[PDB]
Every structure is written in structure tokens, then in C-alpha cells.
């Protein structure tokens, strides 16, 4: 059974997600407009969406119990390394399996594989990305499990550049033990069937997606005309 401490962790993470995820998508009007019908016509809009999402991921991470107690250098390392993965994870909430798209409230803000390719990305990323979204969606995670998985993703001690790896691991262990205990005592069978191992495998998949996205991001952002279309925060967090 969940301890009071573990229940507090879950409550904090649910609150953190709800303060940083807007299921009305009301801010999307502020982004540069999507353009479809120009191999990069969607780059300005999707750069703004990604930048917006980085802000949300930072806001979520700062609420993870213990995260703000790490050194600021480790906080930065963890966020720089995990941000793209948490974006991929949190985007699953808008992903719909009926047409393999991210539906953010309106047709203008419904993104399919063509839209992602129109930000410069290729099938080498988009195909595993869609496969990941479908696989994650088919787990039918409780929101508790979803916010625990994002938190575990962020506080991973094996990220490159982490200095106090043992302190990071201590936070992740608290979160992992909370997730395992939640699955065992609150996820009804058979849905709990190897759910933890499957969620861990999703973290492995996100590492592979991270490497491919970074490879394509580095190639795209190396061209100054493309970097010009990004945002200051994207350049700072994803690299310049």
C-alpha cells in the first residue's frame, strides 16, 4: 500500500502537471501561425510550440520533490537532456490514434506526420516517434503513472554531465518506488501486467528518440537560416 509520503509525492506531481498542462490549448493563438498546403513552412509555429513546451517542462520539473535541492548545474544538465523526451511524453495526452496526430483543440493546431516533416524532420525520427506514441497510448496510463513517468524521466542519474549522480538517483528511486507501489495497489488487474517493465522500456525508447531528434536538430540548426526561425529558449536548451 502507498505510504502517506508516497501519496504526497503523487499529489505534488498531479498538481505540478495540472499547473503546466493546459488542455484548452488557449495559448496556441500566440504562436507564429502554422503554414501548410516550403519544406520548412511549419518550423516557425512548431518552434514556438516546442519553446512553449520547454517552459512547461521546466515548470513541472521545479515541482518534482527534491529537484530544486540539486545544484543548479545538475538541474540544468537534467533539463537540457530530458526536455525533448518529456515533450514527447507529455504530447501523448493530445495524441489520437484515430489518425496518428497530435490534436491540440482545432484543425489549425492538429499536427500530423507531414507537419512534423515540415519542421525539417525525416521519417527516421517520425516513424519511431509515432510508434512510441501508439505504444504509450496503448498502455492506458493513469494520470498518476503519467506524471510519475515524466518525473522519473527528468531525474535520471545517467544523463551526461550529471555531477551529483547519487543525489539524483535518490530522488529517482523515491519516484520509482512510488510508481511500483502505485501500480501494485491502485492499478486494477490485468492492466498492472508488467506495466512497470513496459514503462521502463518507454524510457529506453525515449533515449533512442532523443538521440535521433538531437542528430536532426543539430543538422537543422547548423544552418543559420533555420536557427533564425527558432526561439531564444530553444537555442539555449536544445543547443546553439
Amino acid at each position: 500500500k502507498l505510504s502517506e509520503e508516497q501519496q504526497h509525492i503523487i499529489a505534488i506531481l498531479l498538481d505540478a502537471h495540472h499547473k503546466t498542462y493546459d488542455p484548452t490549448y488557449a495559448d496556441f493563438r500566440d504562436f507564429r501561425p502554422p503554414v501548410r498546403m516550403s519544406p520548412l513552412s511549419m518550423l516557425p509555429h512548431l518552434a514556438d510550440l516546442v519553446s512553449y513546451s520547454i517552459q512547461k517542462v521546466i515548470g513541472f520539473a521545479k515541482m518534482i520533490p527534491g529537484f530544486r535541492d540539486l545544484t543548479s548545474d545538475d538541474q540544468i544538465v537534467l533539463l537540457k537532456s530530458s526536455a525533448i523526451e518529456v515533450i514527447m511524453l507529455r504530447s501523448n495526452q493530445s495524441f489520437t490514434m484515430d489518425d496518428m496526430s497530435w490534436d491540440c483543440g482545432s484543425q489549425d493546431y492538429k499536427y500530423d506526420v507531414t507537419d512534423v516533416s515540415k519542421a525539417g524532420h525525416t521519417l527516421e525520427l517520425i516513424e519511431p516517434l509515432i510508434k512510441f506514441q501508439v505504444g504509450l497510448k496503448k498502455l492506458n496510463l493513469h494520470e498518476e503513472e503519467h506524471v510519475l513517468l515524466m518525473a522519473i524521466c527528468i531525474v535520471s542519474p545517467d544523463r551526461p554531465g550529471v555531477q551529483d549522480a547519487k543525489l539524483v538517483e535518490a530522488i529517482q528511486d523515491r519516484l520509482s518506488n512510488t510508481l511500483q507501489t502505485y501500480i501494485r495497489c491502485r492499478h486494477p488487474p490485468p492492466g498492472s501486467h508488467q506495466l512497470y517493465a513496459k514503462m521502463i522500456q518507454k524510457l529506453a525508447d525515449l533515449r533512442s528518440l532523443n538521440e535521433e531528434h538531437s542528430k536532426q536538430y543539430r543538422s537543422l540548426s547548423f544552418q543559420p537560416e533555420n536557427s533564425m526561425k527558432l526561439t531564444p529558449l530553444v537555442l539555449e536548451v536544445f543547443g546553439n
Partner: peptide, 11 residues
């Protein structure tokens, strides 16, 4: 490099 925007969002 420095990460002032990331750092400000962490405060």
C-alpha cells in the same frame, strides 16, 4: 555557456 533563461524559469 550560461543558461539564464532556463535558470530564471527554475527560480
Amino acid at each position: 555557456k550560461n543558461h539564464p533563461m532556463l535558470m530564471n524559469l527554475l527560480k
